[PDB]
Amino acid sequence: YLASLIRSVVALHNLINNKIANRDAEKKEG
Amino acid sequence: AAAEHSQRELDTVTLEDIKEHVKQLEKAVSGKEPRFVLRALRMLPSTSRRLNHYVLYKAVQGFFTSNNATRDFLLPFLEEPMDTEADLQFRPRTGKAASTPLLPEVEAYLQLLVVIFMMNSKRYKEAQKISDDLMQKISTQNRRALDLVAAKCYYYHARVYEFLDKLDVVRSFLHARLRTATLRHDADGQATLLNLLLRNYLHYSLYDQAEKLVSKSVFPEQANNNEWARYLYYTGRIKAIQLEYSEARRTMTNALRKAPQHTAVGFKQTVHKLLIVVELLLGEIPDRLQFRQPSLKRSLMPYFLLTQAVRTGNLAKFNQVLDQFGEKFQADGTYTLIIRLRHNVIKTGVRMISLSYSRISLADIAQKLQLDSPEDAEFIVAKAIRDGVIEASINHEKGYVQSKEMIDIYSTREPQLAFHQRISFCLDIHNMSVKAMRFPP
Amino acid sequence: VRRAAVESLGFILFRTPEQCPSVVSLLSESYNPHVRYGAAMALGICCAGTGNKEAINLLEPMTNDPVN
């Protein structure tokens, strides 16, 4: 359970980073 | 006056905001993604304020302007500014942009602005016609993205009929629209329509109908946390009325957990009231902090008095608080539950006795619970044991109530089951987070 | 056999040249070079003489591959 929680938190952080990156690219395009 | 100039400044920044929102709607239309629509309706409540008559007049005279019947429908419903010196022609659509018919998203959003502004002006009849026309227009449209927008206006439609105090001339329409969304496999629209229908049912006290539907219909998990919270609150009320008290408590706890942090004071207050009442019905004393919150202090103060009266075991105090503030419960829609608790107080005392003692005799239980006879104590403790509130057994041979001896749970399979639920949730969270990943082309 | 299997994409998709670059957009970046050669040959075969500018775009950097 601890390892699964670690992995889920890591995946959530990665998804947040990816959303931030794609929004940064979209806003920097203009 | 410079005050009117500053009003014009905030009006034109609202114009820029709505221009950004309609641009996002068109980007969603041309980008094959509905999340931009969700973001537009997320910014929608923020710009539901800061608007006036001229804001919406300039909006409808900037967009549309195709000489369609839409102009003939929305212009007469709002006032117009005079020949202002700052005749800044606000024209987001130029030539071919104004030539093509407006997308359902943008026209729906601007008509929504009309109806919410009309509601803010508190003349419900004027907004009734614009809402009916809006939903006549969007009924034929089968756009997937529009459903999102449709979802929102759906809610607003029911909202206006709340101020019209009818709530019944549209029940069949909401039923049909929910069915249409179900066959469209929509998530947001189905969830919001279920929530609105449940609210209508509870406003007209048809709890059996709501129970039947929630037994038949399935709430979409992949919905808004706000809609999830509303559905959980309504379901908790249903289960509380249906005597399913433990499930109601769990559902209302989940609804409170999913409440929008600090955004909905009234919804949180109502959820706290109902949760406190049902928890008292279970025999559990609620959290004290609920009554000392800055926003929920006065709202739950009668419930503080109720909880104090039942915990102290003073039924006279219970009747007294019924006499003074109990009528307020009728306004809060909890009077029947409060009467049930008035006649179910003794369950709390039985639970306290079970928690403290482990082999307390029947006579001692009757003495400590103000019960007249030991046989009445036997009946009450047996009923409480059967109804899943106590974990004891009465040795009737010599009249002592032996609680079930506590076994080492870590040596049992219960921790494995709890960890299984937690692991499944964590793996599902990881799968959801990795599943989208939103890599743009 | 991997080379031939990838090259069969051209023979399977020449009738609909639009789909061919989509599947082979990434066959062109495998770790082994034989699959890359098969991807290039499939791209050449599927679209016959269409100025797709998508197969051309995919072949633009591949012609700089370290493998010969």
């Binding site: 601890l2 390892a3 699964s4 670690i6 | - | -």
Partner: protein, 83 residues
């Protein structure tokens, strides 16, 4: 000849159902979880000071999950098979 050269490193059938030393499995879990604790400290510091703990944490999680899952499943298979 391919299969009968494969017979060289092929594990026996008794190896699949065998269980790793339980007293050793606990020590391995303790060690790797403590490394994961240090890694979590480093990850918190790195993420907070952003506006390679992640890869190390993921590798440790893979190791822990595969070890514990395999041991648990072997335990269940052994409990059912031998009665």
């Amino acid at each position: 000849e391919q299969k009968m050269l494969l017979n060289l490193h092929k594990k026996s059938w008794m190896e699949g159902l065998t269980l790793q030393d339980y007293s050793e499995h606990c020590k391995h879990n303790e060690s790797v979880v403590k490394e994961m604790l240090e890694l979590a400290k480093n990850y918190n510091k790195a993420v907070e000071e952003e506006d390679d703990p992640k890869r190390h944490l993921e590798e440790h999680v893979d190791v822990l999950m595969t070890s514990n899952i395999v041991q648990c499943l072997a335990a269940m298979l052994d409990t059912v098979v031998f009665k």
